[PDB]
Structure 1
Amino acid sequence: GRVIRNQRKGAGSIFTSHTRLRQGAAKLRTLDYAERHGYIRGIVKQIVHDSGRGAPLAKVVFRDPYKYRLREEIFIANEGVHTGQFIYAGKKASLNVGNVLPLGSVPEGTIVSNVEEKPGDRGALARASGNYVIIIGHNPDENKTRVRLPSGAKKVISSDARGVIGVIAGGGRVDKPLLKAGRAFHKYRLKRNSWPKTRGVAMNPVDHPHGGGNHQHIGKASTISRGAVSGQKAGLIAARRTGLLRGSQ
């Protein structure tokens, strides 16, 4: 049998990200002395689009404390952030929308975003459109704060891990229907080559573990094991359950 679409996506020839039209790596400015001990003021110089990503990027000009420059940094604009407004990044920075303070230096119940998994990561969590973390709990004894992720999972991050206050802008983007194929086409054309997906069942048995038959049908269980080899996984990997539930998910 052939190597499946799924299998040869990871070889990464044509399936690589379309990265010409993008502004750059959206990160928080590196964890440094000024952010540890005080905070730096930055100016939201412009708020720009980014291709394959449905959340505006806030290009915010900071200074260089050590040499005479203006180190420009590319953020993911929180909703209500505007042009020329002052962003404040550090431990001592005030609790306003746009500001970058460590989760330890923040009260409980805050709606934070662009959070770090490790301290000095420069943003990992709640980075997509209309998504945010809720800082549930705390503990200064073994300084590690409890947080609730957009997936609804509770994690425990260090107190020195930073995050930007408010929700990430561009929310409700998914609640409009994409519409007539071409909208999807154009959406995908600037992220990746993962579009118009052929159904394994509609292929020949060479091409997919679903192929063949005188009727289109999977034939055996679509719930595949976790221990299934890299090449065997087509359907639902390590499916705890299946089917449409009644009442609440």
Structure 2
Amino acid sequence: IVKCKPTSAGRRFVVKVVNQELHKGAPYAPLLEKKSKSGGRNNNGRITTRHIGGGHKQHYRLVDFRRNKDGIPAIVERVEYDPNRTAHIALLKYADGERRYIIAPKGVAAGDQLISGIGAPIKAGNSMPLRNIPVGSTVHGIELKPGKGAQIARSAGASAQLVAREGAYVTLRLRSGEMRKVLAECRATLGEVSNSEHSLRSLGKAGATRWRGVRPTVRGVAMNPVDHPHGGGEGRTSAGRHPVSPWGLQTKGKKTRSNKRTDNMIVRRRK
């Protein structure tokens, strides 16, 4: 993590994250495919999600989440950059070829973990079911329906903690603060996700956000009464309604969960 010298008006506050562990140039080619840019537009053609557009060409990488190979020792080749994600991914190699990308744990550059219904059991990077692990451990990549794949604790530097165990349900405390009960045969992976040098970065200039795929936002007090309920005014007005979405939704604190189907699996709400 380096600082930049103020040579220009853009370079004054750029904070980079450089890494020399990353493999310089190539992706492995059969694990790579085409991805198109949406613009934030559904099949009616209209903008649903605002402030998206532009950017750069990207290839989607088929990152493996199931880890269904069992009893095979896998050996890491190298750690690569992945553009549609905040973590680093690793290239694996099993005992008989069959290379494959996974989310990289804290271990890097040819360790050899073992992916099984239980084996070699404890490292960073061993996948094994959630009943055969000690309490108080830190895991990541947690399935919720068995066979479906990792859904929770998957972004950069993220993890969860085991707390309790009884019956079919193995309770864990999420990164947010919510404590879920999770069914016990869903697999998970010991350790933490690789790139934690990511909350320490600053873009510096206005055109740095724009070549990543985020389009300018405009405030609601600088519009007309026809466009946004904060509306127009004379001079700078305090927008004399209570603060509200452009569709009429209260925004400074209003509980909006209404699922009413998964409420049994939650122990404690996030506070």
Query: What TM-score comes out, normalization by structure 1 length?
Result: 0.72
Aligned equivalent of 2:82, options 50, 58, 62 = 50
Aligned equivalent of 1:77, options 104, 120, 134 = 104
Q: Which residue of 1 aligns with 2:197?
A: 172
Instruction: Show the 5 A alignment for 1:125-164.
Output: 125-139=152-166, 141=167, 143-164=168-189
Per the alignment, in what secondary structure is the counterpart of residue 76 of structure 2? strand
Deviations 1:68-105 (A, max 9, x none): x74333211111x2223223112212210111111111
Q: In structure 2, do the counterparts of structure 1 residues 9 and 70 end up closer, same or farther at CA, with 3 Å as the change threshold?
A: farther
Per the alignment, in what secondary structure is the counterpart of residue 201 of structure 1? coil
2:237 matched to 1:231?
Answer: no
Equivalenced residue count is 213
Deviations 1:135-158 (A, max 9, x none): 11112x2x2101111101111111
Structure 2 residue identity aligned to 1:26 = V
Contact kept in structure 2, 1:27 and 1:123, CA below 8 Å: no
Structure 2 residue identity aligned to 1:198 = V
Structure 2 residue identity aligned to 1:83 = A
Q: Which residue of 2 aligns with 1:202?
A: 222
User: Aligned-pair distance for 1:129?
Assistant: 0.8
Following the alignment from structure 2 to structure 1, what is the Cα–Cα distance between the partners of residues 54 and 206? 21
Structure with a larger share of its residues in helix: 1
Contact kept in structure 2, 1:114 and 1:124, CA below 8 Å: yes
Q: In structure 2, do the counterparts of structure 1 residues 90 and 234 end up closer, same or farther at CA, with 3 Å as the change threshold?
A: same
Instruction: Show the 5 A alignment for 1:84-95.
Output: 84-93=110-119, 94-95=121-122
Following the alignment from structure 2 to structure 1, what is the Cα–Cα distance between the partners of residues 135 and 87? 26
Query: What TM-score comes out, normalization by structure 2 length?
Result: 0.67
Q: Which residue of 2 aligns with 1:10?
A: 48
Q: Which residue of 2 aligns with 1:246?
A: none
Over aligned residue pairs, what C-alpha RMSD do you find?
Answer: 3.2
Structure 1 residue identity aligned to 2:75 = I
Contact kept in structure 1, 2:118 and 2:129, CA below 8 Å: no
Q: In structure 2, do the counterparts of structure 1 residues 223 and 167 end up closer, same or farther at CA, with 3 Å as the change threshold?
A: same
Contact kept in structure 2, 1:109 and 1:134, CA below 8 Å: yes
Please say which of residues 106-115 and 15-24 is displaced more in the overlay: 15-24
Deviations 1:2-28 (A, max 9, x none): xxx9xx64279x947979524524332
Q: In structure 2, do the counterparts of structure 1 residues 45 and 18 end up closer, same or farther at CA, with 3 Å as the change threshold?
A: farther
Instruction: Show the 5 A alignment for 1:23-42.
Output: 23-31=60-68, 35=70, 39-42=71-74
User: Aligned-pair distance for 1:30?
Assistant: 4.9
Unaligned runs of 5+ in 1: 64-68, 225-229, 241-248
Contact kept in structure 1, 2:66 and 2:150, CA below 8 Å: no
Q: Which residue of 1 aligns with 2:133?
A: 106
Q: In structure 2, do the counterparts of structure 1 residues 89 and 148 end up closer, same or farther at CA, with 3 Å as the change threshold?
A: same
Structure 2 residue identity aligned to 1:207 = D
Structure 1 residue identity aligned to 2:115 = A
Contact kept in structure 2, 1:100 and 1:162, CA below 8 Å: yes
Following the alignment from structure 1 to structure 2, what is the Cα–Cα distance between the partners of residues 135 and 60? 27
Contact kept in structure 2, 1:112 and 1:166, CA below 8 Å: yes
